[PDB]
Amino acid sequence: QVQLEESGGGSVQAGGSLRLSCAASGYMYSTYSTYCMGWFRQAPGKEREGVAFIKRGDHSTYYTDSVKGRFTISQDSAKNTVSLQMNNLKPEDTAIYYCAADFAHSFLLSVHSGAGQYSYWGQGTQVTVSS
Amino acid sequence: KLILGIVLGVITFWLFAQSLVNVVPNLQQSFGTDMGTISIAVSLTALFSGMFVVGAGGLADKIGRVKMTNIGLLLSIIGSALIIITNLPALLILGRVIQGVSAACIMPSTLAIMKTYYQGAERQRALSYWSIGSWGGSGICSLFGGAVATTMGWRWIFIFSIIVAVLSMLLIDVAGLIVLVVMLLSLNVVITKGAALLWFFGLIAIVIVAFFIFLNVKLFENKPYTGATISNFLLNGVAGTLIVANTFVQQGLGYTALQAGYLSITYLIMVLLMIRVGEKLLSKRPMLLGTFIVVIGIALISLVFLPGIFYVISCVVGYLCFGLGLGIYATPSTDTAISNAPLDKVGVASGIYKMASSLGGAFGVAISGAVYAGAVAATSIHTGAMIALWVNVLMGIMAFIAILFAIP
Ligand SMILES: [Zn+2]
């Protein structure tokens, strides 16, 4: 009973910029615990691939190679939400972006990426780029 | 003496057990099977423990106390050895099941040795050191397992289980029991399904059905020990206070994971240095002090829902005032139960006091979370938080009013 309500994305010209936000409803922290949160993309062609993830507890970010430098995941701590600020988007980035969050764990443990680890998934938000 | 020195080694066999719960992502790759199936696998420990601790206490009552404590500490070797040996899915299930029944054996039996250890006055020194064993054991189960996973790994956190379980031993009739476990098995996962889920009203039946079938089928208690047990349940209802507080601070006010640690470990150091003052405090006086001063603990964190700049003061004093109150009531309540209980039926009576403690928590958390998750969805974080904190105050007041049915 932990909904992930995600917003933003949409179509844009190539080399442009797009925002993708996603907040987690009614997801509580244990006595010395936190959870990791980010997006996976999946174009009609290739299979589900990881993009960017952040450890909610201590802003511990991790990116994939493809998007490194252009994309910048971050949490608006006061408004309580993660958001992936995408830039210089290439037509490879064209896919359906899925916001996901894994089951809680000790905050001492490191940030996660593997799709097997992530357990809460969003409906999915579409993003497309072109000439 | 080396009477507790071994006993605490059996309580620290239940620190290592509940540390692995907070390191599920590491052994999901090793054991291979996905999350959700491997998670419920690790859940089985406290699951099997909660339903068997009553029976395992009543069978320790007859078969022998140190007999069962020998069984448990021996069963804590295979419980850990099975898991740490090889990581694979179907095996991981059984390893935690026996880890669960291992705790069911230890808790009631080692609680009975303490009465033989002193039998008055020098019993409070033992029960206090027993409380240090469990509250320290659970209090850092997460912060430990995580710190171990970083440097060494998930393997070197469970090799410490076998060696401490041996070093412990170095210092050493199914009357509806099947319709008891079926009521507890269900009731244990009525709070977990209550959040998830239908089996929401469906699983409440098999609790109520297996309750009345077990009601008319060892039920024989009438003394202030009952008052001490019922009060214990209501007090553990305000356990949710901390989890809803940690959430509010880290999500609402937006602090880091380490600040959450400092506010929490401050509460942990406090409570562990009051169970010491608890034995000196003594029966009804300190338990009325504890059940009262915890309600203040909430009020200071409730008022942080209408904060200022210097309300980190008002929040901190909350964690302290909450922490000490548990510690004050901590070592007198365990005594008032362990004392009044008959010397013939200690293993049976102790298991009931420990489960009433267990359910109290799980029950409290479920309410606190559900209220928070509902109130924050209706209104905001700051508003919704206080609504959940208030629901704890009521239970904390009821825990203070629960002492009304507990004479000196
Ligand atoms: Zn994670």
From TrEMBL, chain B:
GO molecular function: transmembrane transporter activity
Chain ranges passing through the membrane: 3-24, 36-59, 71-91, 97-114, 126-148, 154-172, 177-196, 198-217, 227-248, 260-278, 286-305, 311-331, 352-375, 387-407
Membrane topology note: Multi-pass membrane protein
CDD domains linked: MFS_MMR_MDR_like
Cellular location(s): Cell membrane
Entry keyword Disulfide bond: no
Superkingdom of this protein's organism: Bacteria
Domain Major facilitator superfamily (MFS) profile: residue ranges: 2-408
Recorded GO CC terms: plasma membrane
Keywords, sorted A to Z: Antibiotic resistance, Cell membrane, Membrane, Transmembrane, Transmembrane helix, Transport
Biological process per Gene Ontology, one example term: response to antibiotic
PANTHER family per record: MAJOR FACILITATOR SUPERFAMILY MULTIDRUG TRANSPORTER MFSC
The family this protein is said to belong to: Belongs to the major facilitator superfamily. TCR/Tet family.
Stated name of the protein: Quinolone resistance protein NorB
Native species: Staphylococcus aureus (strain COL)
